[PDB]
Design a protein around this ligand. Structure first.
Ligand SMILES: CC1=C(/C=C/C(C)=C/C=C/C(C)=C/C(=O)O)C(C)(C)CCC1
Length: 176
């Protein structure tokens, strides 16, 4: 019954960028295909005088050859017609880091405790997502109340991504 068209997905009513600024800890994630951040992920959002939003993020990345590395990444966001939908150009501090362009949607947030993000990097012909990713972020590393977990579990259902998210460890590897 429930529609999986990325076009139909709901997003944050009247997104407020400055209000999202600060440190966010990823608690759980739904990885995309290929190399992705492993764990110990922490994002840090900024918004300039102009309204230009930017972010930095640390995360452990396992390189093909098995070395583990603490990837220091960079992201710049571009506004769209949808205040909660942005275009994100990212790159790493080190040259060997994945560089790219991806959609960045703020599905839901309360700005103070949690946030569900999402990106489809490929649309199937039908209109659903063939390559997605999603971050569940928390204001406090400790996580959230069974109350908010309810909400999140709900946003996840709506993104056609329930029962396929994983918990993210934080063990200070990239120093925390
Ligand atoms: C920029 C950006 C994001 C994507 C980061 C990616 C995609 C990092 C990939 C790192 C790799 C791919 C490192 C490596 O493999 O060296 C996320 C949504 C958290 C949202 C805001 C900041």
């Amino acid at each position: 019954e429930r529609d999986c068209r990325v076009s139909s997905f709901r997003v944050k009513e009247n997104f407020d960028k400055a209000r999202f600024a600060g440190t966010w800890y990823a608690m759980a994630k739904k990885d995309p295909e290929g190399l992705f951040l492993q764990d110990n992920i922490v994002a840090e959002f900024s918004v300039d005088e102009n309204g230009h939003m930017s972010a930095t993020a640390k995360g452990r990345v396992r390189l093909l050859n098995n070395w583990d590395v603490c990837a220091d990444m960079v992201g710049t966001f571009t506004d769209t017609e949808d205040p909660a939908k942005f275009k994100m150009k990212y790159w790493g501090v080190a040259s060997f880091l994945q560089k790219g362009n991806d959609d960045h949607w703020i599905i839901d947030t309360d700005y103070e405790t949690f946030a569900v993000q999402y990106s489809c990097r490929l649309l199937n012909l039908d209109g659903t997502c063939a390559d997605s990713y999603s971050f569940v972020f928390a204001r406090d590393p400790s996580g959230f109340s069974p109350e908010v977990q309810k909400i999140v579990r709900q946003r996840q259902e709506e993104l056609c991504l329930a029962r396929q998210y994983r918990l993210i460890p934080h063990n200070g590897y990239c120093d925390g």
